[PDB]
Amino acid sequence: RNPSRAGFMGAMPPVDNKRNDETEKPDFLITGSSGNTRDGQLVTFSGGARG
């Protein structure tokens, strides 16, 4: 029909998954992070260093 054009050469834009970094371990629960286990910031030695 109406002559379109191709151009581009690279198709879809390179969208990055904002989720990345990781590297270290999330800061001892209580601030974010799902799943997991450990303790409700119990008096247990874990407490802060619950990990």
């Binding site: 008096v43 247990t44 030695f45 874990s46 407490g47």
Partner: protein, 87 residues
């Protein structure tokens, strides 16, 4: 409560945790907290033999896993008359 127990550890995260368990366990009286020096902290407790035993065992096993934990803990059933100079 002539029967005497005492909880000693390195740093007082376990010391106050154990003392909390002490008072938490029975009608025991915390008579003194002492800074040994070099990081050791001691907490004294007075009461009868059974109550002191329950308190000391509860606190010791509770505090063995917190931070750096207990160092040692035992009980005196019939403390000598020198306890008053000792406190």
């Amino acid at each position: 409560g002539i029967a005497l127990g005492m909880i000693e550890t390195r740093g007082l995260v376990p010391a106050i945790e154990a003392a909390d368990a002490m008072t938490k366990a029975a009608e025991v009286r915390l008579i003194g907290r002492e800074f040994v020096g070099g990081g050791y902290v001691t907490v004294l407790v007075r009461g009868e033999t059974g109550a002191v035993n329950a308190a000391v065992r509860a606190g010791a096993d509770a505090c063995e896993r917190v931070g750096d934990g207990l160092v040692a803990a035992h009980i005196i059933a019939r403390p000598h008359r020198e306890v008053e100079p000792a406190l």
